[PDB]
Scaffold this motif. Structure first.
Motif, short mmCIF file in Angstrom:
data_model
loop_
_atom_site.label_atom_id
_atom_site.label_comp_id
_atom_site.label_asym_id
_atom_site.label_seq_id
_atom_site.Cartn_x
_atom_site.Cartn_y
_atom_site.Cartn_z
N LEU A 44 0.78 -1.23 0.00
CA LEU A 44 0.00 0.00 0.00
C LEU A 44 0.82 1.29 0.00
O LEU A 44 1.83 1.40 0.70
CB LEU A 44 -0.93 0.04 1.22
CG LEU A 44 -1.97 -1.06 1.42
CD1 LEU A 44 -2.69 -0.81 2.74
CD2 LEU A 44 -2.96 -1.06 0.27
N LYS A 45 0.39 2.26 -0.80
CA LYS A 45 1.03 3.57 -0.82
C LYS A 45 0.52 4.25 0.45
O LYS A 45 -0.57 3.94 0.92
CB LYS A 45 0.57 4.40 -2.02
CG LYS A 45 1.19 4.05 -3.37
CD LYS A 45 0.63 5.00 -4.43
CE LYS A 45 1.31 4.83 -5.79
NZ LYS A 45 0.68 5.71 -6.81
N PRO A 46 1.30 5.18 1.02
CA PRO A 46 0.92 5.90 2.24
C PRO A 46 -0.45 6.59 2.12
O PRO A 46 -1.24 6.62 3.07
CB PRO A 46 2.05 6.91 2.42
CG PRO A 46 3.22 6.23 1.81
CD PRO A 46 2.64 5.60 0.57
N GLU A 47 -0.72 7.15 0.94
CA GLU A 47 -1.99 7.84 0.71
C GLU A 47 -3.16 6.86 0.83
O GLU A 47 -4.24 7.23 1.28
CB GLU A 47 -2.00 8.49 -0.68
CG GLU A 47 -1.65 7.54 -1.81
CD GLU A 47 -1.36 8.27 -3.11
OE1 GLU A 47 -2.32 8.61 -3.83
OE2 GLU A 47 -0.17 8.50 -3.40
N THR A 48 -2.93 5.61 0.44
CA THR A 48 -3.98 4.60 0.53
C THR A 48 -4.18 4.23 2.00
O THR A 48 -5.30 4.04 2.45
CB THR A 48 -3.61 3.34 -0.27
OG1 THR A 48 -3.30 3.72 -1.62
CG2 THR A 48 -4.77 2.37 -0.29
N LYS B 45 -3.48 -0.68 -10.28
CA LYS B 45 -4.94 -0.62 -10.35
C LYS B 45 -5.21 0.02 -11.71
O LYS B 45 -4.39 0.79 -12.21
CB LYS B 45 -5.52 0.29 -9.26
CG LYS B 45 -5.59 -0.28 -7.86
CD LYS B 45 -6.21 0.76 -6.92
CE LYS B 45 -6.47 0.22 -5.52
NZ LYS B 45 -7.00 1.29 -4.63
N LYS B 309 6.84 12.09 -5.45
CA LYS B 309 6.85 11.73 -4.03
C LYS B 309 8.00 10.93 -3.43
O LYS B 309 8.35 11.14 -2.26
CB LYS B 309 5.54 11.00 -3.70
CG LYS B 309 4.29 11.78 -4.07
CD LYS B 309 3.03 10.98 -3.77
CE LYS B 309 1.79 11.76 -4.17
NZ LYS B 309 0.55 11.03 -3.84
N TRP B 310 8.59 10.00 -4.18
CA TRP B 310 9.66 9.17 -3.63
C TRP B 310 11.03 9.27 -4.29
O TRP B 310 11.15 9.55 -5.48
CB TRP B 310 9.20 7.71 -3.60
CG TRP B 310 7.98 7.51 -2.76
CD1 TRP B 310 7.93 7.41 -1.40
CD2 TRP B 310 6.63 7.46 -3.22
NE1 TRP B 310 6.63 7.29 -0.98
CE2 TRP B 310 5.81 7.32 -2.08
CE3 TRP B 310 6.03 7.51 -4.48
CZ2 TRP B 310 4.41 7.23 -2.16
CZ3 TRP B 310 4.63 7.43 -4.57
CH2 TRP B 310 3.84 7.29 -3.41
N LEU B 325 5.52 -2.76 -2.67
CA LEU B 325 5.45 -1.35 -3.04
C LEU B 325 6.58 -0.99 -4.01
O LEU B 325 6.45 -0.05 -4.80
CB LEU B 325 5.54 -0.46 -1.79
CG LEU B 325 5.42 1.05 -2.05
CD1 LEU B 325 4.08 1.37 -2.70
CD2 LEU B 325 5.57 1.81 -0.74
N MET B 328 5.22 -1.86 -7.38
CA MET B 328 4.17 -0.90 -7.70
C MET B 328 4.74 0.42 -8.19
O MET B 328 4.34 0.93 -9.24
CB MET B 328 3.30 -0.65 -6.46
CG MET B 328 2.48 -1.84 -6.01
SD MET B 328 1.86 -1.66 -4.31
CE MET B 328 0.94 -0.15 -4.44
N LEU B 329 5.68 0.97 -7.43
CA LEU B 329 6.30 2.25 -7.77
C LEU B 329 7.12 2.19 -9.05
O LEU B 329 7.01 3.08 -9.90
CB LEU B 329 7.17 2.73 -6.60
CG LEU B 329 6.54 3.73 -5.61
CD1 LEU B 329 5.07 3.47 -5.44
CD2 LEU B 329 7.28 3.67 -4.28
#
Ligand SMILES: Nc1cc(CSc2ncc[nH]2)c2nc(N)[nH]c(=O)c2c1
Ligand SMILES: Nc1cc(CSc2ncc[nH]2)c2nc(N)[nH]c(=O)c2c1
Ligand SMILES: [Zn+2]
Ligand SMILES: [Zn+2]
Lengths: 366, 366
Positions: A44-48, B45, B309-310, B325, B328-329
């Protein structure tokens, strides 16, 4: 906001609901803290994580001190900046994972070989400072279950000595003492007299919050509830009560009924990736063939994004196919479910109908 | 919108930029299609896939016919509803993965044992219909490289016979013929005369778009470009030209310079999970120790959410730690990078400065 301010807005029996105000944000209690292992809440991303309703997350220290390293994270700007979570973060002392994930113990601390390292109350506190932790946990020794009265006493006594050392180390670092908070941890296994001695020692020292440690180690819910019955009342009433590592939905409801204000557990995340999804009618294992063509969402009432967009059939497919999106979706739903549970708990207490909510919840969940 | 309408808005040399209008949405060309294996673009997603700028995604058929199954997906409402992507979806015929992922070939089709199944032009088209594909690919036989002129001819000839069968099967299904589009696939290995015969056969049959198949099978960019030089001009100019399985950034630029309008490749997703991140200065492997304390984003100009962001240091940590993550990123960034590349290509062509963009891109990328 202030460095730390816990305020109780409403109560029902032993249950309480309120807020913890800190520099990085407000924490609604009873609260559930998603666990971030290795600077990330898995999948999960922090925003999620924030979108699900989480006000604070727990950062695993033991893991971070090994990789990427406390000094490195500090050099890079702190854990908050590093992982992209700007709200409060509670960090454990690492005094648990060390004696389970990797060891020689002594009054000075614990030396271990990562799965050659030394960890003491002083170093633990320093590491949490380097990470930029908002809520720092005292360095303790989790007592293994079952434990004889003698071993439980020795362990508890050492933890209290370490609690004093944690306190002094924390206070001696101006930046940390002024911006973060420190929680002490009650030990004593399942023995009432030891729990009392531990509670008294911790209160004598003085902490911003008090955690009930040593539980959720294989004693069973019945035994856990029995220990909580006499243990939580021993802690200062005007400070937060944190039950470490407890997360089963029913465990949480029962603990709140006994005075607990904070929780953390890897269950929602770990189970999510394993195929277990929480619903108000109990958990379900999405891998089960019965869900292959089920178009309903994971839970019929859940307001999370996963239940608004995808079916059990799709997630069933994803998980059995080993797809990353499966873990992402299952985890977001589970954490959202937990947050919705905490909200229902907070609301019922504020409205003086928590006891009824607890009974209705159990009837349907089981 | 209409069932299918390809319009060319601007051109420069052999390059073209325009749009493909379909019932489920508009596709900007040159276009890059993220690949979704098993009803999901790995680690993303659908909303994230769309956020990167993707107008259409490619759905892997071979995988879907095995699990969860074409009939099942149809029963559940179609692939779009199933995975939550409501825009166009192009589906391959499965005539490639079968002869590489799992087999007995014949003029009737191919029977195989999943890693007992039969796949023919008729069944392939039916499966794509059951999935609810917007752009259906004719069922062909990808010729292995290297290939002797005789084997390449035999394979190409069979593919053309199968192309006619694909056409008729597609047209005989009213619902499909009226709402979806059908693309034919040019074969012929690296031989000019075979490519010409294939192009003529396909044009004689008539398709909504023409794909250049049989490339990106180990011939090298130089050879691929050489074949494209004489192959693309053979295809109908007023229909889209799709180069299957080609995705390296430099491959894409060169292919567009040669008349290609559509691309798909697993590189951005697969490489992302492997640690490779694309940047305007060339790809970098984020696992490299040199990135352990690099606070800069993956790419200095990229406008994707990951680069906003990262840091490289964080992603470096995630990937080396095997965290979800990380995948995902890395994947979101890579797919966003590819879309930004397509946008820069589209814009430069519209402004008659694509040739210059191609040269500047190469100079800096290499
Ligand atoms: N049960 C339990 C869990 C945790 C870790 S918090 C956590 N649990 C699971 C993930 N994170 C504990 N930590 C400390 N320091 N002391 C304890 O007594 C103790 C007891
Ligand atoms: N190179 C290539 C790639 C693909 C698959 S599209 C894809 N590639 C990678 C992921 N998806 C092809 N498919 C067909 N049907 N025919 C071909 O000649 C062919 C050639
Ligand atoms: Zn949900
Ligand atoms: Zn980026």
């Amino acid at each position: 906001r202030p460095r730390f301010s816990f305020s109780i807005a409403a109560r029902e029996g032993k249950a309480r609901t309120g807020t913890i105000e800190m520099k990085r944000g407000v924490i609604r209690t009873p609260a559930f803290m998603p666990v971030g292992t290795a600077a990330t809440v898995k999948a999960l991303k922090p925003e999620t994580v924030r979108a699900t309703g989480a006000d604070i997350i727990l950062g695993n220290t033991y893991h971070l001190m090994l990789r990427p390293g406390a000094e490195r994270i500090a050099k890079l700007g702190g854990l908050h900046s590093f992982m992209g979570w700007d709200r409060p973060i509670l960090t454990d002392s690492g005094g648990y994972q060390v004696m389970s994930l990797s060891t020689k113990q002594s009054e000075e601390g614990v030396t271990f070989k990562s799965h050659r390292h030394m960890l003491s109350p002083e170093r633990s506190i320093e590491i949490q400072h380097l990470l930029g932790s908002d809520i720092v946990m005292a360095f303790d020794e989790c007592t293994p279950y079952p434990a004889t009265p003698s071993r439980a006493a020795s362990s508890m006594e050492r933890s209290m000595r370490w609690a004093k050392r944690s306190r002094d180390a924390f206070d001696s670092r101006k930046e940390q003492a002024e911006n973060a908070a420190l929680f002490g941890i009650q030990q004593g296994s399942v023995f009432e007299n030891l729990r009392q001695q531990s509670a008294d020692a911790l209160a004598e020292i003085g902490f911003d919050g008090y955690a009930v440690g040593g539980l959720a180690v294989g004693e069973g819910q019945d035994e856990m509830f029995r220990v909580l019955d006499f243990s939580v009342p021993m802690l200062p009433d005007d400070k937060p009560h944190y039950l470490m590592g407890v997360g089963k939905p029913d465990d949480i409801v029962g603990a709140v009924e006994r005075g607990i204000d904070m929780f953390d557990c890897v269950l929602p995340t770990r189970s999510g990736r394993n195929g277990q999804a929480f619903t108000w009618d109990g958990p379900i294992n999405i891998r089960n063939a019965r869900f292959s063509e089920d178009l309903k969402p994971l839970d019929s009432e859940c307001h999370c994004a996963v239940c608004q967009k995808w079916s059990r059939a799709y997630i069933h497919h994803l998980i059995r196919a080993g797809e990353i999106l499966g873990a992402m979706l299952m985890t977001e739903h589970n954490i959202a479910f937990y947050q919705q549970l905490m909200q229902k708990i907070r609301d019922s207490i504020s409205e003086g109908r928590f006891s009824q909510f607890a009974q209705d919840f159990r009837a349907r969940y089981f």
